[PDB]
């Protein structure tokens, strides 16, 4: 599981 925070893509892998 990964939190949604960035710009164009949600998943922070």
- Asked if residue 10 lies in contact with residue 1, where contact means CB atoms within 8 angstroms, the answer is no
**φ and ψ at residue 2, rounded to 5 degrees:** -140, 140
DSSP secondary structure letter of residue 4: B
Give the CA count within 13 Å in the CB-facing half-sphere of 1: 1
Alpha carbon distance 4, 9 (integer Å): 8
Full DSSP string of 1-13: ---B-SSS--B--
Resolved by:
NMR
């Amino acid at each position: 599981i990964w939190g949604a925070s960035g710009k164009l893509i949600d998943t922070t892998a």
